[PDB]
Amino acid sequence: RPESELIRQSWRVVSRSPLEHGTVLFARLFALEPSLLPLFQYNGRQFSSPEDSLSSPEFLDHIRKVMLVIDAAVTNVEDLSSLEEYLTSLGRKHRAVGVRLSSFSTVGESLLYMLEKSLGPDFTPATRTAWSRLYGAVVQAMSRGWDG
């Protein structure tokens, strides 16, 4: 598949510095959907502003977790069936913390923003399409965690 190669090559750029890039992803996410901020409750306390989240070690560890799951999807781009049961359970976990299924479209747009800004002119419409399809497949598997 030509799409598989566009994903592996663009990911190579991002995965060199995962926290710096995941920081961009989450900064964009809170700019688009501020109501996601209170869902990160560590020690039963809420962040007041988005910049508060960037000083939290637990929050930064969640950024690392996110980037590792994407890395697993990229590594298995030819065979995403192998990640399916793990992703369903990851969906169930997020449902339990209070994430709505609709918020996964915002996450997808923030991922595309982070790729666009990192790759610049190397972010071609073919690259955008490849990532949209991969992200779509990941979301389909996770959405099984919301009962169906």
Q: Please report whether residue 137 would count as binding ligand HEM according to CB under 6 A.
A: no
Please, which of residues 7-66 interact with ligand HEM by CB under 6 A? 36, 39-40, 58, 62, 65-66
Nearest to 5 by CA among 113, 127, 137: 127
Which of 24, 83, 107, 141: binder of ligand HEM (CB under 6 A)?
Answer: 107
Of the two residues 6 and 99, which places its CB atom closer to ligand HEM in the complex? 99
Contact status: 134 vs ligand HEM (CB under 6 A): no
Task: Check binding of 112 to ligand HEM (CB under 6 A).
Answer: no
Which of 69, 74, 75 shows the shortest CA–CA distance to 89? Answer: 69
Site string for ligand HEM, 78-97 (x = CB under 6 A): ------------x--xx--x
Cα 135 to Cα 112: distance, rounded to the nearest angstrom:
10
Do 114 and 21 touch, CB atoms closer than 8 A? yes
Return d(Cα 147, Cα 95) in angstroms, integer: 10
Residue 49, phi-psi category: left (phi > 0), alpha (psi -120 to 50), beta (remainder): beta
- Residues in touch with ligand HEM (CB under 6 A): 36, 39-40, 58, 62, 65-66, 69-70, 90, 93-94, 97, 99, 103, 107
